Write a protein that binds this ligand. Structure first.
Ligand SMILES: Cc1cc(N2CCOCC2)cc2[nH]c(-c3c(NC[C@@H](O)c4cccc(Cl)c4)cc[nH]c3=O)nc12
Length: 116
């Protein structure tokens, strides 16, 4: 119920978002919505029911669609859990995801503390 100003959400969370984008090659599979046809994985939507990626998250931050920062956390973990569900433990994407998730856990905590 406590509502955060959309511009306070941007200044606080956008550095945490840049931290994942800057991971290269690990972030590349995550920067745009998964396109099953274009990638040749047409079973993707039979398995992933709520897709999510960095461009959608950033667009929500840019346009003030999050009311409080834990919705941002939600979308980021949903993005990770989607990739861990779909790709096999031995795939590059799966390990790319784990890297991104290590980057996120190491930097989100002081940011969420400052937001109160
Ligand atoms: C740390 C961690 C490790 C792993 N492992 C790596 C992959 O394979 C083996 C397991 C999976 C995780 N799943 C989630 C998770 C969420 N975390 C909140 C946490 O960030 C958090 C909690 C309180 C305050 C803050 Cl500031 C931040 C939230 C919603 N849904 C989630 O699934 N956290 C995971």
């Amino acid at each position: 119920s406590m509502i955060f100003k959309p511009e306070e959400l941007r200044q606080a969370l956008m550095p945490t978002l840049e931290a994942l984008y800057r991971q290269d090659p690990e972030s590349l599979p995550f920067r745009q919505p998964v396109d099953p046809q274009l990638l040749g994985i047409p079973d993707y939507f039979d398995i992933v029911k709520s897709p999510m990626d960095l461009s959608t998250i950033k667009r929500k931050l840019d346009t003030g669609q999050y009311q409080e920062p834990w919705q941002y956390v939600d979308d980021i973990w949903l993005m990770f859990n989607n990739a861990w569900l779909y790709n096999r433990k031995t795939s590059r994407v799966y390990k790319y995801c784990s890297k991104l998730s290590e980057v996120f856990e190491q930097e989100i905590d002081p940011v969420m503390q400052s937001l109160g």
